[PDB]
């Protein structure tokens, strides 16, 4: 019952969010391949609505971080419909209060490295010109 | 709880693990896109996806289930109205299933397990209907029940 029963929570991914994410994916994905390139992922992120709404001026940096995370997760390889889902689940909760010790450390290191890479690439782009 | 390694964890950790396990089995929805300029099928697709239509189907199924309030017997002088009402409900369900199939997809409809179960139920219903039209026995009433 704990495993399966779901209710609208505050700091957790809910069933309504799951259904809305599936709807967005379906309106994004064409033939249910489950693998999409970076452009499809970023357009899906732009099209996310509801509780997972990402205002541009509010979380532009977060959106860029998520897009680069999707890029780096497979060295530019296409996601498997769960990498996006796993990323959304991770970014929609409190990592410190939820994950286990080793998993929390690994996730924090990975997110910090991704943020540093994004900042370095942004600086390189802004300084090359 | 201790043997499965969750007693030492916090409640939030357990919730996160349960969410991860749940998302592991989540799968994309099975709705093909609605075609444009094909009003005959696009309108049907809109009809089948209307929440009021789903509530109507649920209410009809509930009424058909209620139709089994009394025991079905051949000696029963009032089983004929129940059989007729069940036949009408089965006809409605079969026509609705056919409408959903033609609107959604001849094969994509099969993607949903719920739709497969509904198709099986409607097939059993039409088989029972024709058997009632032919056999008309207590075994037929039991099959319909």
From Swiss-Prot, chain A:
Gene: Nalcn
Name of the protein described by the UniProt record: Sodium leak channel NALCN
Record note on quaternary structure: Found in a complex with NALCN, UNC79, UNC80 and NACL1; these auxiliary subunits are indispensable for the function of NALCN channel. Interacts with UNC80; required for the NALCN activation/inhibition by GPCRs in neurons. Found in a complex with NALCN, UNC79 and UNC80; UNC80 bridges NALCN to UNC79. Interacts with CHRM3.
Subcellular location: Cell membrane
Parent-record interval covered: 1450 to 1578 of 1738
Tissue and organ distribution: Predominantly expressed in the brain, moderately in the heart and weakly in the pancreas.
Domain-related comment: Contains 24 transmembrane helices (TM) that form four homologous functional repeats connected by intracellular linkers. Each of the four internal repeats contains five hydrophobic transmembrane segments (S1, S2, S3, S5, S6) and one positively charged transmembrane segment (S4). S4 segments represent the voltage-sensor. S4 transmembrane segments lack some of the charged residues (K and R) found at every third position in the S4s of the NaV, CaV, and KV channels.
Summary of the function given for this chain in its UniProt record: Voltage-gated ion channel responsible for the resting Na(+) permeability that controls neuronal excitability. NALCN channel functions as a multi-protein complex, which consists at least of NALCN, NALF1, UNC79 and UNC80. NALCN is the voltage-sensing, pore-forming subunit of the NALCN channel complex. NALCN channel complex is constitutively active and conducts monovalent cations but is blocked by physiological concentrations of extracellular divalent cations.
Post-translational modification remark: Phosphorylated on tyrosine residues.
Family under the similarity heading: Belongs to the NALCN family.
Curated annotation (Swiss-Prot), chain B:
Membrane-spanning intervals of the chain: 52-68, 78-101, 113-134
Domain of life: Eukaryota
PTM field: Phosphorylated on tyrosine residues.
Positions on the Extracellular side per record topology: 69-77, 135-137
Tissue: Predominantly expressed in the brain, moderately in the heart and weakly in the pancreas.
Subcellular location: Cell membrane
Residue ranges that the UniProt entry lists as topological domain Cytoplasmic: 1-51, 102-112
Domain notes: Contains 24 transmembrane helices (TM) that form four homologous functional repeats connected by intracellular linkers. Each of the four internal repeats contains five hydrophobic transmembrane segments (S1, S2, S3, S5, S6) and one positively charged transmembrane segment (S4). S4 segments represent the voltage-sensor. S4 transmembrane segments lack some of the charged residues (K and R) found at every third position in the S4s of the NaV, CaV, and KV channels.
Protein role: Voltage-gated ion channel responsible for the resting Na(+) permeability that controls neuronal excitability. NALCN channel functions as a multi-protein complex, which consists at least of NALCN, NALF1, UNC79 and UNC80. NALCN is the voltage-sensing, pore-forming subunit of the NALCN channel complex. NALCN channel complex is constitutively active and conducts monovalent cations but is blocked by physiological concentrations of extracellular divalent cations.
Family: Belongs to the NALCN family.
Record's subunit section: Found in a complex with NALCN, UNC79, UNC80 and NACL1; these auxiliary subunits are indispensable for the function of NALCN channel. Interacts with UNC80; required for the NALCN activation/inhibition by GPCRs in neurons. Found in a complex with NALCN, UNC79 and UNC80; UNC80 bridges NALCN to UNC79. Interacts with CHRM3.
Protein name: Sodium leak channel NALCN
Species lineage: Eukaryota, Metazoa, Chordata, Craniata, Vertebrata
This protein's encoding gene: Nalcn
Segment of the intact protein contained: 1160 to 1304 of 1738
């Amino acid at each position: 019952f704990s495993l399966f029963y779901s209710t609208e929570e505050d700091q957790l991914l809910s069933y309504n969010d799951l259904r809305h994410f599936q709807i967005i994916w379906n309106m994004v994905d064409d033939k249910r391949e489950g693998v999409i390139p970076t452009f499809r992922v970023k357009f899906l992120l732009r099209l996310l609505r509801g509780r997972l709404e990402v205002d541009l001026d509010k979380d532009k940096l977060l959106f860029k971080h998520m897009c680069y995370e999707m890029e780096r997760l497979h060295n530019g390889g296409d996601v498997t419909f769960h990498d996006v889902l796993s990323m959304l689940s991770y970014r929609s909760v409190d990592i410190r209060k939820s994950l286990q010790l080793e998993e929390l450390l690994a996730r924090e290191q990975l997110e910090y490295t991704i943020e540093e890479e994004v900042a370095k690439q942004t600086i390189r782009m802004w300084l090359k010109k | 709880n201790e043997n499965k390694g969750t007693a030492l964890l916090t409640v939030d950790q357990r919730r996160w693990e349960d969410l991860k396990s749940r998302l592991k089995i989540a799968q994309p929805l099975h709705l093909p896109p609605r075609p444009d300029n094909d009003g005959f099928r696009a309108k049907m697709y809109d009809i089948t996806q209307h929440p009021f239509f789903k509530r109507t189907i649920a209410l009809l199924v509930l009424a058909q289930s209620v139709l089994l309030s009394v025991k079905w017997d051949v000696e029963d002088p009032v089983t004929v109205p129940l059989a007729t009402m069940s036949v009408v409900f089965t006809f409605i369900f079969v026509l609705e299933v056919t409408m959903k199939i033609i609107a959604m997809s001849p094969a994509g409809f099969w993607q949903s397990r719920r739709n497969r179960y509904d198709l099986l139920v409607t097939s059993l219903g039409v088989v029972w209907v024709v058997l009632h039209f032919a056999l008309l026995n207590a075994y037929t009433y039991m099959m319909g029940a």
